[PDB]
Paper text:
Using single-particle cryo-EM, we determined the structure of T. maritima encapsulin packaged with a heterologous IDM complex. To encapsulate the IDM complex in vivo, six subunits of IDM and encapsulin from T. maritima were constructed into individual operons and coexpressed in the insect cells. The 30 amino acid cargo-loading peptide was fused at the C-terminal of the IDM1 protein. The overall resolution of the encapsulin icosahedral shell was solved at 2.87 Å based on the gold standard Fourier Shell Correlation (FSC) 0.143 threshold. We did notice that there were missing densities at the Gly189 and Ala188 position, which was probably due to the flexibility of the A-loop. In our IDM-loaded encapsulin structure, we have found extra density at the fivefold pore in both icosahedral shells. To test if the extra densities were an image-processing artifact of icosahedral reconstruction along the symmetric axes, we then performed de novo C1 reconstruction and found extra densities at all 12 fivefold pores in the C1 reconstruction. The extra density should thus be authentic structural features of the IDM-loaded encapsulin that might be caused by substrate binding or cell factors copurified from the insect cell.
Author numbering:
A (entry chain A), B (entry chain A), C (entry chain A): 4 to 267
């Protein structure tokens, strides 16, 4: 929006469109948490904190009037900057079909990594606890495909006792998935054995996790709080090059850890 | 069209039709690039160059008035000739069901090879760079079916980081495909393992490539510029035999090499 | 248009208008070729090459499939820059009737010279051959007004044998015209003798030619290919002064040299 100062950038709508398109593509392919966790919002651009629903009592014990502070999560405000040559975007309206947008891509990837780190590991400063921080819900299993299938069945039994329902999905490191696919036959695809044991579920290979998670997708158990979603705006000129920025505001909340299981 | 001088050939519409039909069949089965790359046009018959969208500056540095030349790709104009006996096409209207059209077939195959060479290797004279010239995007993999599947998964991970989406297709040499199918079981078809790892994609066996390519089919990344598409016209008489020709005008452009991956 | 970034210049419409007006005036008075040669287009801003209608065959002699490259003329892209003080354009809306626009005028004159040089001499780099390069069509004549009239009659006889019709015009260096007017009487204006021998034609005094040309104006024999016509846009700030630029894209083609005659 208006705080992005896009109107003041020496660019045509065509160039803005190309930039936005490439950003969207990289993001859709590089944002992995967005695949498992719900999204609420956007609340922005002014939204500053998400309530937790508790009071920390600061009053002493023998005070007549008891009082405390109501708790919330501060939204994380993200800024990153790109620099694009001008002589090279105007070749777009000169008829060039492929305009170099490399710095955009690099920095987009970096911010995607940032958000995925928050979701998966969290942030102490912000008070966010990541999915991989709920060590209290973890299975110890082997390292073969068969061990993996047994572990998945165990996980679904756990979900059963805890009342957790819904489609299930398995988030794996890419390398471990590849090695599971390589380690044993072959006489029936492993992905099918899995999608069967993972009863109507899916597999999602994610390089930002090392081992694996099993999560239910019924809804409402992991949620990303959105103020200002990812947006690109303008800062200044270089002057032969334009400096833009990408920004966001967000927090993350694990609501029901019972819908989460870690695997070794 | 009119530049083809078909009206001046001592032939009936029946004979023209037979000729055109056989040409179309051979072409549909022998034109392999047409299976992966988009086609724009036809622009012909006068279209002479396709713009690139850049200026090469020829002005010196200290000139007051700066100037350069706007760049483009010249269209390649293709001619080949056939000779057909007359006594042998008139047997068509005499009731013969199978008329010999061998020279047509041979020369059609040759021109198909020509276009496929341009697409795959390119042309220095014309300034076309072929698919197999983007060595900067190449994977080193093994030689077994399992190695192949691992390589395909690696390729799709690459497409993932580069923001490349869409159906995927695997262009292979026929011999290597056959040997992959022969080398190991058997207890589950390899083509299915592939179409699965090649997630909803295809395999296309192409004798004009030696090893393999993986390419996305989302659209707009490889494109063939068409002026005058493949057409047959008339030159002269022999006189007992008619001399015809086949012609085309075309260039080729790889727009987004990120949608391209070479395999060993 | 939009590639000119006029909207991003810290200027009001009044100032843009003054600038454009002065540019147009200087151009109309300083563009001499525009007086004789036809103009086609504008094709821009993406137009990159104008077809010539020929194929250069690169195929060897004994190749089965013959091929070549279709030929064209690259458009020349022209850039020049002006710098205008700000404190001095805002006095326009302060009520000043005469705003200093000298750098504009100088640079406009320079680019006009550039285009006239291309038309008259041509450009080797671009492959343009100028009017004064067709030495094969040249008359040797005297240096007196009477010699000039005889030469004009000879030229029209030539046009006669070559089938060239239409109004005729005589492009002369200014100095030679003046000296012809001074050299002999006087008892009947020379311009009238000329316009008579130059049967219903004209005289156009042009400082970018040294001796003279006679050309027919029937149409279609000399033509200027226009992509982006002359236009002014914005580059940056200085910051107390605004930097603008003037740009064009064009080529030139002599189609029928029979409509052209050079005089000594």
């Amino acid at each position: 929006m208006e705080f992005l100062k896009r109107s003041f950038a020496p660019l045509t709508e065509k160039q803005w469109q190309e930039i936005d398109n490439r950003a969207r593509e990289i993001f859709k392919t590089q944002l992995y948490g967005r695949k498992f966790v719900d999204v609420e919002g956007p609340y922005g651009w002014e939204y500053a904190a998400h309530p937790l629903g508790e009071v920390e009592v600061l009053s002493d014990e023998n005070e007549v009037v008891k009082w405390g502070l109501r708790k919330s999560l501060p939204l994380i405000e993200l800024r990153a900057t790109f620099t694009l040559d001008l002589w090279e975007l105007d070749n777009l309206e000169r008829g060039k079909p492929n305009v170099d947008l490399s710095s955009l891509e690099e920095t987009v990837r970096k911010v995607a990594e940032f958000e995925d780190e928050v979701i998966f590991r969290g942030c102490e400063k912000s008070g966010v606890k990541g999915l991989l921080s709920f060590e209290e819900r973890k299975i110890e299993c082997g390292s073969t495909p068969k061990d993996l299938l047994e572990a998945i069945v165990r996980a679904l039994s756990i979900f059963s006792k805890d009342g957790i329902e819904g489609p299930y999905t398995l988030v794996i490191n890419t390398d471990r998935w590849i090695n599971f696919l390589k380690e044993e036959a072959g006489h029936y695809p492993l992905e099918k054995r899995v999608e069967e044991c993972l009863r109507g579920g899916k597999i999602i290979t994610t390089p930002r996790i090392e081992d694996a998670l099993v999560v239910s997708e019924r809804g409402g158990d992991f949620k990303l709080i959105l103020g200002q979603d990812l947006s690109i705006g303008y800062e200044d000129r270089e002057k032969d090059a334009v400096r833009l920025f990408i920004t966001e505001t967000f927090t993350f909340q694990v609501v029901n850890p019972e819908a989460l299981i870690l695997l070794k």
